[PDB]
Amino acid sequence: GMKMLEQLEKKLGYTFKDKSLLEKALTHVSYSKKEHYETLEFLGDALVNFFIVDLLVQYSPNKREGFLSPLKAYLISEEFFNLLAQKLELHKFIRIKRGKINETIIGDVFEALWAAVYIDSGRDANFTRELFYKLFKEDILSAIKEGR
Amino acid sequence: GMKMLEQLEKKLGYTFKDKSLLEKALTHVSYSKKEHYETLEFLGDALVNFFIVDLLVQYSPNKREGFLSPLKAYLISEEFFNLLAQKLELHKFIRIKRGKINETIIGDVFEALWAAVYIDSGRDANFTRELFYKLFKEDILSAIKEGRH
Ligand SMILES: [Mn+2]
Ligand SMILES: [Mn+2]
């Protein structure tokens, strides 16, 4: 919606039913102490961590946990979440006040977005995961084979 | 006086399409080096983590990260995981060698068990989620209102 949201949604590849759901995920507490992303981030943290270990398990030509922890630490790293975030230019949609966006914050909004997509889609974890793979399964896969 | 190998499906309310997927989850290295639950439990960690957290987020009274976290470390602890497995008599079904099973293998088999369901199901996160909740949604909410840890 609005003169902005519609554009994040086309990059996202998903249009929301509840627009304020999307907005809450992009909004820093500095902007609204009443409706900001902290709780969605909490959810999206577990959600995304799940999406990525799934790809990790599914792929990865080595299956011992001893191999899986390292790339995993990377794939959930703030550095890698910023990488995927860049594919949506998320810095551009975040709602913030007295202060500037960060990698960390971009990292937390990213988890928040996915939690609201999950929820907005009626808590549809299979669709959400696929949305996620459409967008990022390519990088995640290139990552695993030692992609800087 | 029957149903030794399993009974566990009727507990879960789910019949596996591939039995060796359920077998794999309940199998520890000491019994089978070929297929033990190691990789599933890795998945299962992340799987059950999200089931619990999703519940936590909608049902806890305080939606602040401050209050959610200490509850969350409880609800995904081996201790509590065990209390969830006791409802499955999971120990009963584990294919483990020697005499020491322990509390770490069990919550781990608990973890690898909901990952095997996930996968057997054709990766249906939603169905697996509800299947999970039908069995423990009860105890998770409860534990939220008492608030431990
Ligand atoms: Mn975060
Ligand atoms: Mn574990």
The single residue listed with the structure tokens 């971009």 is A106
What domains can you pick out in chain A, each with its CATH number?
Answer: 1-148 (1.10.1520.10)
The letter for the amino acid at B104 is: T
Query: What are the φ and ψ backbone dihedral angles of B27, each rounded to 5 degrees?
Result: -115, 120
Tell me the C-alpha distance between A117 and A128, whole Å. 7
| Cβ atoms of residues A25 and A110 within 8 Å | no
Tell me the C-alpha distance between A120 and A83, whole Å. 24
Name the token pair of B69. Answer: 């976290």
Sign, CA dihedral A79-A105-B47-B28, equals positive
Contact between A68 and B126 using a beta-carbon 8 Å cutoff: no
Tell me the C-alpha distance between B58 and A43, whole Å. 10
Tell me the C-alpha distance between A38 and A29, whole Å. 8
Query: In terms of C-beta density within 10 A (0-12 exposed, 13-18 middle, 19 or more buried), how is residue B10 classed?
Result: exposed
Burial B123-139 (b: 16+ CB within 10 A, else e): ebbebbbebbeebbeee
| Cβ atoms of residues B101 and B91 within 8 Å | yes
Tell me the C-alpha distance between A65 and B41, whole Å. 9
Name the token pair of A138. Answer: 């390519």
Tell me the C-alpha distance between A94 and A104, whole Å. 13
Name the token pair of A41. Answer: 């981030």
Distance (Å) from the C-alpha of residue B106 to the closest C-alpha of chain A?
17
Counting Cα atoms < 13 Å in the Cβ hemisphere of B110 gives 26
Q: Is B18 a catalytic residue?
A: no
B73 shares contact with chain A (CB less than 8 Å): no
CA separation, residue A34 to residues A126, B64, B100, B111 (Å): 30, 11, 52, 36
Contact between B38 and A65 using a beta-carbon 8 Å cutoff: yes
Tell me the C-alpha distance between B100 and B144, whole Å. 32
Question: What region, left, alpha or beta, does residue B98 occupy, with left being phi > 0 and alpha being psi -120 to 50 degrees?
Answer: left
Counting Cα atoms < 13 Å in the Cβ hemisphere of A33 gives 0
**How was this model experimentally determined?**
X-ray
A43 shares contact with chain B (CB less than 8 Å): yes
Binding residues of A for Mg(2+): 41, 108, 111
Q: Which of A100, A84, A83, A95 is nearest to A36 (CA)?
A: A95
CA separation, residue B30 to residues A68, A99, A138, B38, B85 (Å): 21, 55, 37, 12, 21
Resolution (Å) of this entry: 2.1
| Cβ atoms of residues B71 and B60 within 8 Å | yes
Tell me the C-alpha distance between B114 and B110, whole Å. 7
| Cβ atoms of residues A96 and A109 within 8 Å | no
Q: Which of A80, A87, A77, A72 is nearest to A131 (CA)?
A: A87
The single residue listed with the structure tokens 């293998």 is B105
Facing B50 at nearest CB: one of A38, A50, A124: A50
| Cβ atoms of residues B23 and B35 within 8 Å | yes
Tell me the C-alpha distance between A6 and A19, whole Å. 10
Q: Which residues 106-125 on chain B approach chain A with CB closer than 8 angstroms? A: 123-125
| Cβ atoms of residues B91 and B77 within 8 Å | no
Tell me the C-alpha distance between A27 and A39, whole Å. 11
Name the token pair of B147. Answer: 């608030």
**Maximum pairwise Cα distance, chain B:** 50
Sign, CA dihedral B140-B143-B144-B149, equals negative
Tell me the C-alpha distance between B110 and B87, whole Å. 11
| Cβ atoms of residues B72 and B52 within 8 Å | yes
